[PDB]
Amino acid sequence: MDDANKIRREEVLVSMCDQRARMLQDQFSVSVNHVHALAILVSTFHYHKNPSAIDQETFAEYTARTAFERPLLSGVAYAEKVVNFEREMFERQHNWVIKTMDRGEPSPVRDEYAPVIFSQDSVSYLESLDMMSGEEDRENILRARETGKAVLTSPFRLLETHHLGVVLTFPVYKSSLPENPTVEERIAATAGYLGGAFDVESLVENLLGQLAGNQAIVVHVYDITNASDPLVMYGNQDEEADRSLSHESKLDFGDPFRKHKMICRYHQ
C-alpha cells in the first residue's frame, strides 16, 4: 500500500522492462548479423565459386551447426530470383515445379518468382515455395533488393506453425552490381534473397519465461510503424494486468522502415 514502497515498485518495473528490451534487441541484432554472414556465404561459395560449393545438403549442415548463432530465428533459407522467361528452364534443371505458399500447388504464371532452393531442415517445408506468393514476404523481398539492406515484415502468422512472428530478408546480388548502384541497378543485379523467420511467439516466450521475476510481469511488444494502427508482435493484449502502472521500453530492430516498443506491467 505504502507510497514510498510504490516508488520502489515502479523502479523495479522500469529496471525489469528495460533489461528485457535490451536482451530482445541485442539477440535480434546478433541474429541479423549472422544472417548477413550467410548472405555473404551464398554469394562467395555458391555464386562466385566455379563450381558452386553449396548444395541443399551443405546448406542444411552448415545452418544446423550454426543455429546457435541465430538465437531468435526458427530457420533460414535462400530463395533464388527467377523471371518468367527462365521458369521452364529453372524447373527442368531442378526437377521440380515452383509452388505457391498458400496451398503448395504449382504456381500460376507471374512476372517473377522467389522459389526457395536451400533451406535449414527446421524450415524444409519452404523448399520450392515461391516466397513472392505471400504478401508479407513479397513486400520484404522487394524492399530488401531495392535498399540493399536487411528488412523486416509486420507481424503475421508464419507457415506451418502459424506462430505469430516476423520475417527478416537480406538481398544477394550478382557480381555485376555497379559501385554506388541506383535502385534500378540493384533490381537488375539481384540474384536472390536470404531470409529467416523470427518466431516471436515461441522463441521470445522461451527467452522471457526463463528470467527471474517473469511471473510478476506482463510483457507486450508492438509494431508501431503506423502510429494509429499499432500491431501486436508479442503478448496477450488484454490479459489480467495492472491497469494503474506501466512502463515503455525502447526497442530498435534495425530496419528504419519499422518502429517497435515494449510495454510492461505487473500482473496484479
Question: Where on the chain is the footprint of its own copies (CB under 8 A)?
Answer: 30, 33-34, 36-37, 40-41, 43-45, 48-49, 53-54, 58, 61-62, 65-66, 69
Taking CB under 6 A as the criterion, the residue among 24, 167, 191, 218 binding ligand WA2 is 167
Type and span of the H or E element at 205: helix 200-209
203 lines the binding site for ligand WA2 (CB under 6 A): no
- Residue closest to ligand WA2, measured at CB: 195
End-to-end CA distance of the chain: 13
Interactions with ligand WA2, residue window 63-82 (CB under 6 A): 75, 77, 79
32 lines the binding site for ligand WA2 (CB under 6 A): no
Break-preceding residues in the chain (C–N over 2.5 Å): none
Confirm or deny that 169 is annotated as ligand binding.
yes
Closest separation in Å from C-beta 36 to its own copies? 8
Q: How many other C-beta atoms lie within 10 A of the C-beta of residue 1?
A: 4
172 lines the binding site for ligand WA2 (CB under 6 A): no
Three-state secondary structure call for residue 234:
strand
Query: Own/partner pairs for 255-261, CB < 8 Å, 24+ apart?
Result: 255/149, 255/150, 255/151, 255/152, 257/143, 257/151, 257/152, 257/225, 258/152, 258/154, 258/223, 258/225, 259/223, 259/224, 259/225, 260/221, 260/222, 260/223, 260/224, 260/233, 261/221, 261/222, 261/224
Sign, CA dihedral 202-208-214-219, equals: negative
262 lines the binding site for ligand WA2 (CB under 6 A): no
Q: How far is CA 47 from CA 53, 78, 175, 210, in A?
A: 9, 13, 9, 42
Cα(108)–Cα(102) distance, rounded to whole angstroms? 12
Instruction: Determine the angle formed by the axes of helices 3-42 and 200-209, rounding to 10 degrees.
Output: 130
Taking CB under 6 A as the criterion, the residue among 137, 201, 223, 255 binding ligand WA2 is 137
Give which of ligand WA2, its own copies, none residue 123 binds (C-beta under 5 to 8 Å, depending on kind): ligand WA2
> Segment contacting ligand WA2 (CB under 6 A): 9-17, 22-30, 102-110, 133-141?
133-141
Q: Per DSSP, what are the bridge partners of residue 86?
A: none
Closest separation in Å from C-beta 10 to ligand WA2? 39
Confirm or deny that 13 is annotated as ligand binding.
no
Q: Smaller CB distance to its own copies: residue 36 or 174?
A: 36
Contact, 146 vs 139, CB < 8 A? no
Closest separation in Å from C-beta 182 to ligand WA2? 22
Place of cell 525489469: 16
115 lines the binding site for ligand WA2 (CB under 6 A): no
Task: Give me the 229-258 binding string for ligand WA2, x by CB under 6 A, dash otherwise.
Answer: ------------------------------
Give which of its own copies, ligand WA2, none residue 131 binds (C-beta under 5 to 8 Å, depending on kind): ligand WA2
Closest separation in Å from C-beta 108 to its own copies? 37
Cell numbers at residue 225, please?
510503424
Question: Contact residues for ligand WA2 (CB under 6 A)?
Answer: 75, 77, 79, 116, 123, 126, 131, 134, 137, 140-141, 158-159, 167, 169, 193, 195-197
Residues in the annotated binding site for dihydrozeatin: 137, 159, 169
